[PDB]
């Protein structure tokens, strides 16, 4: 499986027209999504496709067209404002796993002249420390997710949950434990923090397959102190 | 003449003693062809007619884990209906799901189905157009409101127009 975005970097003049490309290779035609991520924020869904009308209308003035023969789901907007400067993620859901949302590599757009609360906005520790990231949502959503995003890259799923007490593995679970104690609460635990676990962690909740509402992000840095020292 | 496929998923609460019993029974036309029971020692999945034996071990294994997942949907959603209806947790309830397709010899589709019953009363139902929903009461209205906004109809339409019909003729091509 896979989603493909041909250009990591795109620059267009203010007021001009935009087309962001996306192509998928899947055995069965999947559920298709576009997400936007403004600086210092969690991703926000723009539009989604399940079936029917191949042309779908998004928020903020975006639209996308699905093409089966071309296996494409390109995003487009008539006239771009300065405030459209963000990273755009083509995203997909496998037909048999509708709630597991997987991201494309992402496109950074430079246009030139979600009641999910997560407890630690910022944290710095050292190797070996116990770190718990909290996440609470009052949306009455049954799906909750924990992603991580290395700066410059896309969100990668660690764990997700369907109902209290449920735990389902994501793509990158090694080194993490998670607990869905209640409908509203989903904890992420790093029992022994490693320097490879420094990134931006996003919690999310969902009500509908692939349609996720992201928290504001928990940025964690874990330092091996010995590393930033020249031995005497 | 016409032909049909129908799946009846049923979950019932049990006083105190753990998880709800799960039932899933498949019908081709009106004849039972497949069955799943959670109460069975090794619940799995099974054939109810001889002509369904020619199906591979992959078909049965996959179709079983699908039902194993379905149990979670019911466990969760029985619980949410207790909330909607302001009912006590020490009670027992029944939630039934029906889906399927109707076709009569044009090898095309006539009608789709996605509907729910709660304690033997209609809850929500996908309309003939597969775009709109019929909600029986206030609790079902809540569901109807967010299913219309999220696009659940389009979600179910991908199966009902595609795989539902394909597998029906696959099954009909037997006996």
């Amino acid at each position: 499986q896979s989603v493909t975005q041909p250009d990591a970097r795109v620059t267009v003049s203010e007021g001009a027209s935009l087309q962001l490309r996306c192509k998928y290779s899947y055995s069965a035609t999947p559920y298709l999504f576009w997400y936007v991520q403004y600086p210092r924020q969690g991703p926000q869904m723009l539009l989604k496709y399940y079936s029917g009308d191949p042309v779908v209308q998004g928020v903020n003035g975006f639209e996308a067209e699905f093409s089966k023969s071309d296996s494409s789901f390109h995003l487009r907007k008539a006239s771009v404002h300065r405030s459209d400067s963000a990273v755009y993620f083509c995203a997909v859901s496998a037909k048999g796993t509708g709630s597991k949302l997987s991201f494309g590599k992402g496109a950074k757009l430079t246009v030139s002249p979600a009641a999910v609360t997560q407890s630690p906005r910022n944290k710095v520790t050292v190797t070996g420390e116990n770190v718990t990231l909290s996440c609470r949502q009052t949306n009455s959503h049954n799906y909750m997710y924990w992603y991580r995003q290395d700066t410059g890259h896309e969100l990668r799923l660690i764990y997700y949950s369907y109902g209290a007490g449920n735990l389902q593995i994501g793509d990158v679970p090694d080194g993490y434990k998670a607990t869905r104690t209640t409908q509203e609460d989903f904890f992420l635990t790093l029992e022994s923090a490693s320097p490879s676990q420094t990134s931006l962690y996003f919690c999310a909740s969902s009500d509908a397959p692939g349609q996720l509402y992201f928290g504001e992000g928990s940025k964690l840095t874990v330092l091996e102190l010995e590393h930033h020292h020249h031995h005497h | 003449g016409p032909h049909s496929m129908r799946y009846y998923e049923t979950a019932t609460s049990r006083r105190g003693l753990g998880e709800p019993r799960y039932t899933s029974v498949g019908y081709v036309d009106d004849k039972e062809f497949v069955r799943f029971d959670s109460d069975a020692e090794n619940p799995r999945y099974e054939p109810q007619v001889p002509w369904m034996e020619q199906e591979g071990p992959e078909y049965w294994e996959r179709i079983t884990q699908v039902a194993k997942g379905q149990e979670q949907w019911f466990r969760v959603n029985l619980r949410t209906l207790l909330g909607y209806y302001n009912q006590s947790a020490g009670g027992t309830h029944t939630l039934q799901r029906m889906y399927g397709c109707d076709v009569g010899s044009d090898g095309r589709l006539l009608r789709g189905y996605e509907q729910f019953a709660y304690d033997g009363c209609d809850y929500i139902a996908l309309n003939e157009d597969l775009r709109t929903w019929t909600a029986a009461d206030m609790a079902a209205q809540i569901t109807r409101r967010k299913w219309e906004q999220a696009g659940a109809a389009e979600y179910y339409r991908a199966y009902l127009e595609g795989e539902c019909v394909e597998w029906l003729h696959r099954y009909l091509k037997n006996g």
Binding site: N142, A208 | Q70, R97, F116, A152, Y155, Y156, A158
Partner: peptide
């Protein structure tokens, strides 16, 4: 094959 995992009520 069966229908996809149903929506939440």
């Amino acid at each position: 094959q069966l229908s996809p995992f149903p929506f939440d009520l």
